[PDB]
Design an enzyme around this catalytic site. Structure first.
Site, PDB file in Angstrom:
ATOM      1  N   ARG A   1     -17.190 -18.612  40.434  1.00 33.18           N
ATOM      2  CA  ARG A   1     -15.732 -18.698  40.479  1.00 33.18           C
ATOM      3  C   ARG A   1     -15.287 -20.055  40.935  1.00 33.18           C
ATOM      4  NH1 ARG A   1     -11.970 -13.804  42.443  1.00 33.18           N
ATOM      5  NH2 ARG A   1     -11.646 -15.424  44.044  1.00 33.18           N
TER       6      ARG A   1
ATOM      7  N   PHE B   1      -7.969 -24.089  45.337  1.00 35.61           N
ATOM      8  CA  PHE B   1      -8.158 -22.906  46.170  1.00 35.61           C
ATOM      9  C   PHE B   1      -9.575 -22.780  46.687  1.00 35.61           C
ATOM     10  CE2 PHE B   1      -8.515 -18.033  46.419  1.00 35.61           C
ATOM     11  CZ  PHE B   1      -8.179 -18.035  47.724  1.00 35.61           C
TER      12      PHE B   1
ATOM     13  N   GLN C   1     -16.663 -20.442  44.570  1.00 35.73           N
ATOM     14  CA  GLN C   1     -17.468 -19.329  45.058  1.00 35.73           C
ATOM     15  C   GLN C   1     -18.800 -19.309  44.348  1.00 35.73           C
ATOM     16  OE1 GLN C   1     -15.415 -15.570  44.532  1.00 35.73           O
ATOM     17  NE2 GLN C   1     -17.095 -14.350  45.396  1.00 35.73           N
TER      18      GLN C   1
ATOM     19  N   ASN D   1     -16.073 -11.794  51.525  1.00 30.61           N
ATOM     20  CA  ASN D   1     -16.125 -10.374  51.828  1.00 30.61           C
ATOM     21  C   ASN D   1     -15.160  -9.583  50.997  1.00 30.61           C
ATOM     22  OD1 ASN D   1     -18.095 -10.180  53.942  1.00 30.61           O
ATOM     23  ND2 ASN D   1     -16.875  -8.524  54.821  1.00 30.61           N
TER      24      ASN D   1
ATOM     25  N   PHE E   1     -18.107 -19.276  49.872  1.00 29.85           N
ATOM     26  CA  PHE E   1     -17.216 -20.142  49.178  1.00 29.85           C
ATOM     27  C   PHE E   1     -16.782 -21.341  49.971  1.00 29.85           C
ATOM     28  CE2 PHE E   1     -13.188 -19.307  51.198  1.00 29.85           C
ATOM     29  CZ  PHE E   1     -13.402 -18.105  51.828  1.00 29.85           C
TER      30      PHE E   1
ATOM     31  N   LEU F   1      -6.356 -16.484  54.647  1.00 31.17           N
ATOM     32  CA  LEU F   1      -7.718 -15.942  54.534  1.00 31.17           C
ATOM     33  C   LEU F   1      -8.472 -15.556  55.822  1.00 31.17           C
ATOM     34  CD1 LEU F   1      -9.041 -18.518  52.007  1.00 31.17           C
ATOM     35  CD2 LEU F   1      -8.332 -16.168  51.415  1.00 31.17           C
TER      36      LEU F   1
ATOM     37  N   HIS G   1     -12.331 -13.341  56.165  1.00 27.94           N
ATOM     38  CA  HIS G   1     -13.646 -14.005  56.037  1.00 27.94           C
ATOM     39  C   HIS G   1     -14.227 -14.663  57.295  1.00 27.94           C
ATOM     40  CE1 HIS G   1     -12.404 -12.993  52.145  1.00 27.94           C
ATOM     41  NE2 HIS G   1     -11.896 -14.150  51.762  1.00 27.94           N
TER      42      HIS G   1
END
Ligand SMILES: [Zn+2]
Ligand SMILES: [Zn+2]
Ligand SMILES: [Zn+2]
Lengths: 34, 173, 34, 159, 313, 260, 285, 29
Positions: free
Chosen positions: D48, D53, D56, D95, D106, D115, D119
């Site tokens: 990803r 942003f 991942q 997670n 990530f 976030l 995480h």
């Protein structure tokens, strides 16, 4: 977009396919031949 | 402390090299390097197409490859059995197509078919309050003595990016 | 194909990249139909 | 059972070196470092990539639903008041739900204040910021999945 | 070379048959070595006894020059196509035409039969080629693609079923069921007039005025380049013995070792008794079923038969 | 103005389209149309015209040059960059595209970019002149190591005596005499006894002559000559002349031997 | 098969019977025949039917009958005033035909679910239109047309009359005329213009009463909230200078390094931000 | 009739490549 027009020529004819026969000269014979 | 791109604890907006902090909506399509190597400049040509569809562009493609011996599994005709599979699948697909064409020559549908739909709007006040709806699709009955409804004759002018070509003396001139 | 394998939740972060609408499973633009 | 500092990600794009906060979160650090040592992350793809942003990776199946910890399957979060996602290049575990962990991790490409609850922060990167921006800029499809394969080639954990 | 490779015997001219009034443009041979057929500017199709070389039967019915002729293997048909625009199917059971495949916008240069499916493939000046369902006389697919006249088309069973080339110098490989191109080769500088598929190797060759290229299958990797004889070359044809023959507009014919590009023999042949020197060169040529005879169609309005020389070494 | 100008545009515009539709190709019609819209600074229209012309005939190199040029004239750097890339991708053999592409990047200041382009270009194994231009490019900056590296690839791509000589000469020009000597050794080693002649051996002799190794020169002259074909005759004569010159730089014994 | 639809058209019943004609109508835009769908939305409703072919919807991303965007339910002129006009599409005749053709192939080659190029743009949003986007279904839109016998005073079907008996709209109002093509292309759309006038009055962005002032006068705090809510909201913006807090009138003053950041926090905030499930209202000075 | 003077006959917006065309616009006559 397929037209509803037709023509004389187009109509079915000879719908069957004449496969060659064994004495006509089917491919089977041909493969074996010298 | 730095306050410049040069130099989580900071509790500052910091953008270290060049991650953009204001809207740009820039056109540029990301340059890419694959695995070890190359800026993928051939990405230009593919642009219109899907990744799946092939397109020759690098010089290497053009250059010759030699030999391959008397034979190798590398060049051979799929096989009997692959051919049978291909041939059969092809045959059925073509026949379907042909029957549609032939529908003209030979001037009745009765299926009631249900479908289940998820919207994309949702929100719990959009339907009565259902994540889905169900629709019964029914084909409309056509009047057999109805003439062709609308007119098809209209005509509008007619490819792929060209594949690379990869292919004089005064006296001769 | 077991429940453990088939239904294991897709891992970790979700990218806001997609609009409420973009995040939904789809087959035909406006939604998913079958 | 060693808390080495930096970790090395030799990827197709380039080489990135990372700093682990053993200080704040030894369990997750041990997990990641051990997997690196094992060669677990070798050949994996950054499945990803979301521009501005995050990036991942850490999934050997490439699906976004695979991967597993040296603790066996999933494990507990190490949340901490000093660990918030301010800035790019922050390394954290990804997670699906609370106190369940897989290798996947990530790297931030920007401040992502929202976030924190989700995480556990692993640490921080040290070298390879041009690299991550170039990865970040790779063309992806509608699912945030890169059209080409941006892969990790060699992972190392010194210390 | 590998080691001064594959010694093949020379060929000699064996027989000359007159009896067309126009250029003979096309030769085909029947599945049992019984009779071989020729298309001509005369507008006839003639069938000739392979053995004696006597003329068996003259058919009439095309309006213009017949350009292409195929004898089906699995059915007792000829297919022929012409400058007229018309592709006809003759039932050799009655020597009459039973069907006609209609729809190209210009002259049809070429045609061929799928060996197992029962579908006919044709090339035309109008830059398309068509896939025709023999049974229903229906344009299954139209292969748009090239920018000039398509010249020679070959059909095969395996992968890239349709191999075609045109005067725009580029070869496209057509995926039959899609009716779309998988591969474009652009390595000839001048018009591709002829192609040929090798009986066993899974390779194919293409000829241009400039030179002749072999190709790997699929996807046409480049393999070799046979260079030698430079003419506008109309014919490429291949024996199971690896003998590749190149015809040409200037009359010349060369024999090649398929493997190496060793050009063992050069044949320049006398033009017919009357005639003119300029009306030389072979429009097309073929090999009987036994691989023992090479037949050529020539602008001097003859058919020449070549026979492999038995004393040779 | 407001309306009066407008009508003019319709008459021209319509005429252009008519011309194109009539003749289809004849790309002078395409080009003139593009030029007119360019002059009115309606360059979005112009772009579409050029693309349409390309659809008709993508191989026409004047068309592409006019298209890229138009973008550059209007300072549309990135459009031009795209276009150049396309041109070289689809018609790689056209050297005009490559020369212009590198020139543009150089003007923009993007040395790295230009280098990248040239590296792409070299994959096509082009023509002596292209390689020279790449080397010269490098030599507009110091970058001597880069230049030498390019030469190393070049003399194998086009392994012509002359190119080898040129490479050696390059080293001489920049005083890498140790390396120049080595290059000559490599050249003679590579070519071998099978084929080598006059030019290279003469050049090597000249090099050592300039290095003030006269005895060595004689050794080379004699030993390498005897080791190979000698007599072709013209070459031999040339070599002999060179030798004589070197010597000059009782002793007219071969004057009598040649005459007798 | 299956149309593309608003949630507002499709109906307020989850159960729906919907009929299909193969080539029913020309689309009023690209003017081709296309599969048409009818259905009854509801009890008093009108039998809506798709007005435009599926392609030119995927092209501008809209319902087939309404021509309102999928996500926003806004006429196209609006959401273009909201992002990107430069999509375009030829209006002119044979172009329209041509561009439609090509774009129809381009769409054919997509994953299928995506409005072509626009979607690359379509993600970045929320400037205004979210705040002017409509919230709930609007059913007044499917009501039957106005009975035109009755509106002359005569209608002789009595109560049976399925049409609607009431006063029509005064032809004076510019909002009347409403061509279809027009609503599609985003030209002089009266509705869209009205919504634009409504957009402007949104008290929001002008700010700047005084130079350099990063002071934030925050009304509607509430005594549940802490400051830490504030900070952990506002560290996104940058380097805070300070924060003044008053809980007697529940107003919180704030100060940032630059005025730019304060404008931002206004923008991002104004009549949008809520935390602690309680609205956090903002003003200058 | 208006396929010419009203609305750009058929439009091909140029394809967009590794560079920024957003900013560019052009002057009147
Ligand atoms: Zn339409
Ligand atoms: Zn609607
Ligand atoms: Zn009424």
């Amino acid at each position: 977009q397929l037209s509803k027009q037709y023509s004389s020529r187009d109509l079915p004819s000879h719908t069957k396919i004449k496969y060659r026969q064994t004495t006509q000269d089917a491919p089977e014979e041909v493969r074996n031949r010298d | 402390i730095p306050r410049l791109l040069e130099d989580p604890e900071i509790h500052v907006a910091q953008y270290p090299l060049d991650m953009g902090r204001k809207k740009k909506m820039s056109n540029a399509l990301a340059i890419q390097v694959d695995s070890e190597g190359k800026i993928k400049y051939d990405a230009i040509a593919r642009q219109g197409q899907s990744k799946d569809k092939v397109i020759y562009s690098k010089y290497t493609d053009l250059v010759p490859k030699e030999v391959m011996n008397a034979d190798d599994p590398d060049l051979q005709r799929p096989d009997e059995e692959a051919i049978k599979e291909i041939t059969e699948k092809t045959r059925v697909a073509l026949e379907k197509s042909v029957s549609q064409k032939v529908a003209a020559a030979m001037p009745k549908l009765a299926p009631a078919q249900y479908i289940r739909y998820t919207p994309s709007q949702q929100g719990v006040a959009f339907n009565s309050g259902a994540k889905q709806r169900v629709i019964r699709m029914v084909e409309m009955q056509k009047d057999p003595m109805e003439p062709p409804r609308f007119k098809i004759n209209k005509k509008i002018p007619r490819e792929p990016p060209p594949a690379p070509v990869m292919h004089m003396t005064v006296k001769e001139q | 194909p077991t429940y453990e394998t088939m239904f294991a939740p897709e891992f970790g972060p979700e990218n806001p990249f997609r609009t409420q609408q973009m995040a939904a499973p789809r087959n035909m633009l406006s939604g998913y139909a079958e | 059972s060693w808390q080495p500092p930096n970790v090395y990600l030799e990827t197709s794009m380039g080489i990135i070196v990372l700093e682990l906060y053993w200080k704040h979160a030894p369990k997750t650090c041990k997990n990641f470092a051990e997997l690196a040592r094992r060669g677990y992350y070798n050949g994996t793809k950054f499945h990803r990539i979301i521009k501005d942003f995050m990036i991942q990776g850490g999934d050997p199946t490439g699906t976004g639903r695979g991967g597993a910890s040296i603790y066996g399957k999933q494990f507990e979060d190490e949340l901490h008041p000093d660990l918030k996602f301010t800035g790019a290049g922050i390394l954290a575990m990804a997670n699906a739900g609370p106190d369940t962990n897989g290798s996947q991790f990530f790297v931030t490409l920007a401040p992502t204040q929202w976030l924190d609850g989700k995480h556990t922060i692993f640490g921080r990167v040290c070298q390879g910021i041009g690299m991550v921006n170039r990865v970040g800029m790779v063309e992806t499809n509608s699912q945030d999945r890169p059209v080409d394969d941006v892969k990790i080639i060699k992972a190392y954990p010194s210390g | 070379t590998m080691p001064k490779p594959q010694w093949h015997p020379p060929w000699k001219l064996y027989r000359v048959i007159s009896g067309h009034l126009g250029w003979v443009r096309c030769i085909a041979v029947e599945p049992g070595n019984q009779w071989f057929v020729t298309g001509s500017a005369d507008r006839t199709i003639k069938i000739w006894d392979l053995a004696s070389g006597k003329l068996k039967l003259s058919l009439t019915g095309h309006i213009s020059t017949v350009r292409g002729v195929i004898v089906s293997t699995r059915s007792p048909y000829l297919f022929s196509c012409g400058e007229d625009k018309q592709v006809k199917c003759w039932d050799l059971e009655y020597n009459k035409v039973i069907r006609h495949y209609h729809g190209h916008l210009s002259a049809v240069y070429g045609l061929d039969l799928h060996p197992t499916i029962d579908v006919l493939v044709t090339c035309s000046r109008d830059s398309t080629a068509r896939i025709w369902d023999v049974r229903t006389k229906a344009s299954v697919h139209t292969l748009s693609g090239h920018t000039n006249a398509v010249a020679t088309v070959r059909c095969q069973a395996a992968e890239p079923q349709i191999i075609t080339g045109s005067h725009d110098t580029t070869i496209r490989l057509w995926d039959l069921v899609a009716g779309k191109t998988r591969v474009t080769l652009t390595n000839h500088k001048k018009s591709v007039r002829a192609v040929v598929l090798h009986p066993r190797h899974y390779t194919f060759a293409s000829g241009s005025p400039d030179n002749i290229k072999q190709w790997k299958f699929p996807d046409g990797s480049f393999i070799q380049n046979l260079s030698g004889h430079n003419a506008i070359i109309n014919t490429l044809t291949v024996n199971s013995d690896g003998v590749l023959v190149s015809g040409a507009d200037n009359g010349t014919m060369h024999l090649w070792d398929w493997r190496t590009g060793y050009n063992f023999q050069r044949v320049h042949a006398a033009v017919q008794p009357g005639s003119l020197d300029s009306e030389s060169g072979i429009f097309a040529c073929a090999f009987d079923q036994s691989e023992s005879r090479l037949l050529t169609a020539e602008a001097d309005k003859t058919i020449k038969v070549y026979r492999e020389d038995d004393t040779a070494t | 103005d407001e309306e009066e100008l407008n009508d003019y545009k319709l008459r021209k515009r319509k005429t252009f389209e008519d011309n194109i539709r009539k003749n289809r190709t004849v790309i002078s019609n395409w080009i003139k149309y593009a030029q007119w819209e360019e002059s009115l600074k309606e360059i979005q229209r112009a772009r579409s015209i050029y693309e349409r012309a390309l659809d008709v005939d993508y191989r026409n190199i004047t068309l592409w040059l006019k298209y890229a040029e138009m973008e550059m004239k209007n300072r549309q750097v990135n459009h031009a960059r795209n276009i150049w890339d396309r041109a070289i991708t689809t018609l790689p053999r056209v050297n005009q595209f490559w020369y212009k592409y590198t020139y543009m990047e150089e003007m923009l200041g993007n040395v790295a970019g230009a280098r990248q382009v040239f590296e792409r270009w070299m994959e096509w194994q082009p023509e002596e002149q292209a390689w020279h231009s790449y080397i010269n490019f490098e030599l507009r900056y110091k970058e001597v190591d880069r230049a030498r590296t390019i030469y190393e690839r070049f003399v194998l791509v086009h392994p012509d005596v002359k190119n080898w000589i040129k490479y050696a000469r390059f080293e001489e020009k920049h005083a890498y005499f140790a390396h120049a000597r080595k290059v000559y050794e490599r050249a003679v080693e590579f070519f071998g006894d099978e084929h080598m002649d006059e030019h290279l051996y003469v050049a090597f002799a000249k090099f050592e002559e300039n290095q003030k190794e006269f005895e060595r020169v004689r050794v080379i002259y004699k030993y390498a000559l005897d080791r190979i074909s000698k007599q072709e005759l013209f070459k031999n004569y040339t070599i002999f002349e060179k030798k004589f010159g070197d010597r000059r730089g009782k002793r007219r014994f071969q004057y009598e031997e040649e005459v007798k | 098969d299956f149309p593309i639809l608003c949630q507002t058209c499709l109906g307020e019943n989850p159960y729906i019977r919907m009929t299909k004609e193969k080539y029913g109508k020309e689309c009023k835009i690209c003017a081709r025949p296309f599969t048409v769908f009818r259905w009854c939305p509801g009890v008093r409703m009108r039998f809506k039917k798709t007005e435009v072919c599926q392609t030119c919807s995927k092209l501008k991303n809209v319902c087939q009958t309404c021509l309102l965007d999928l996500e926003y339910g806004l006429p196209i002129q609006v959401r273009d005033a909201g992002l990107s006009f430069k999509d375009d599409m030829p209006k002119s005749d044979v172009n329209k035909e041509y561009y439609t053709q090509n774009m129809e192939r381009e769409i054919s080659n997509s994953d299928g679910t995506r409005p072509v190029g626009m979607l690359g743009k379509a993600t970045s949003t929320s400037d205004m239109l979210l705040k002017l986007a409509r919230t709930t279904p609007y059913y007044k839109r499917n009501r039957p047309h106005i009975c035109s016998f009755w509106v002359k005073g005569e209608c002789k079907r009595g109560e049976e009359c399925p049409y609607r008996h009431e006063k029509p709209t005064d032809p004076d109002d510019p909002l009347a005329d409403q061509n279809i093509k027009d609503r599609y292309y985003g030209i002089n759309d009266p509705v869209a213009d009205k919504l634009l006038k409504r957009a402007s009055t949104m008290p929001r962005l002008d700010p700047p009463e005084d130079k350099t002032i990063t002071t934030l006068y925050v009304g509607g705090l509430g005594d549940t909230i802490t400051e830490t809510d504030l900070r952990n909201h506002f560290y996104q913006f940058g380097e805070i200078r300070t924060i003044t807090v008053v809980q007697r009138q529940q107003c919180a003053f704030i100060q940032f390094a630059t005025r730019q950041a304060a404008e931002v926090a206004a923008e991002k905030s104004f009549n949008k931000l809520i935390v602690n499930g309680r609205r956090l209202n903002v003003k200058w000075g | 009739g208006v396929d010419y003077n009203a609305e750009i006959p058929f439009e091909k917006k140029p394809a967009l490549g590794f560079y920024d065309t957003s900013e560019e616009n052009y002057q009147a006559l």
